[PDB]
């Protein structure tokens, strides 16, 4: 499977870090704090390949974690799910682990495949959880930059 390692960063220059075992948060990092940003293993997978929508699966390197979309109060939410490392990564991954990589401008979105109109989002305020945001045009940051690592 075609998969590369990289770091994500929202439009407002907020990096993504681990906050406990099963949560990401987005805060500004400076100097050696920047070392602590999480490296994603974005696996390119099969799915509905529209104009700008490339389907992908975001994993956390050597932690055996993948970002999954699931319901709680009939409301889709972002959660980091444990995975068998000898099985994954895979071509035909389950729709809860699948995000549409939208290049809407020269910015990257990440829409949920299983839950349309629900995008990987961050808050304005520093050091708040990464979640799934139900709007594109709201009070939340749905647009990200990408920095490739190898």
């Amino acid at each position: 499977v075609r998969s590369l390692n990289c770091t994500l960063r929202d439009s407002q220059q907020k990096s993504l870090v681990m906050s406990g075992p099963y949560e990401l948060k987005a805060l500004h990092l400076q100097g050696q704090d920047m070392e602590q940003q999480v490296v994603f293993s974005m696996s390119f997978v099969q799915g509905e390949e529209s104009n700008d929508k490339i389907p992908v699966a975001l994993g956390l390197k050597e932690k055996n974690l993948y970002l999954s979309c699931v319901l709680k109060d009939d409301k889709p939410t972002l959660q980091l799910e444990s995975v068998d490392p000898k099985n994954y990564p895979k071509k035909k991954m389950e729709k809860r682990f699948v995000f549409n990589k939208i290049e809407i401008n020269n910015k990257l979105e990440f829409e949920s495949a299983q839950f349309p109109n629900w995008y990987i989002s961050t808050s304005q305020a520093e050091n708040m959880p990464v979640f799934l945001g139900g709007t594109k045009g709201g009070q939340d940051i749905t647009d990200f930059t990408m920095q490739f690592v190898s």
Partner: antibody
Amino acid sequence: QLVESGGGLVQPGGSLRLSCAASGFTINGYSIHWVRQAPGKGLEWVARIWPYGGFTYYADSVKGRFTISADTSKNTAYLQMNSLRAEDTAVYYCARFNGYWNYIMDYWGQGTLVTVSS
Amino acid sequence: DIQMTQSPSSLSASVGDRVTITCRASQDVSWGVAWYQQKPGKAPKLLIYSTASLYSGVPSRFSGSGSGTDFTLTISSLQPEDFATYYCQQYSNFPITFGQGTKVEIKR
């Protein structure tokens, strides 16, 4: 309430440690920001620390020279100031910040006057 | 370092009047704008956070609106205790930056 101490008059090149003691909440759940106001000018953002993570971020005018820290056991935040300049003369405020509960520098200390002069 | 150009420098208006303070950004800060009220020789007080959201305990006569780059603080009816300088802030991008403030002085 956030109560500051440590201010006063100091030689150029000198050192001064400012404290920000918190009452009525634990600083562990917040960031503590430091904001200075030069005599008769506006507000300038100095630095902030998340005590929990130990994450620090400095303005370019104080990076290297100033060190922000926190002792969660003393529910207190610090700004250690070194190589002080006439330019660092200001009232220094500390303020709390938490996004998840809409505490957007909602509490500020009384402020403490730091005069840098020979 | 995102510049927060605040207008005007100072203003005056009579008790009960309607005045709006305007704050413009050097680049897009999204919805990460707050408004602070500082009385002479005292610590700033939070009024508006997240462009439009009013902080608990603030009179409803205080409201704010934004458009990514252009943000307005608006006060419908001036009360007595509003002899204050008003600062805009952006906290979406670090370093955090403030406007130079607007002093509002009650007319007689």
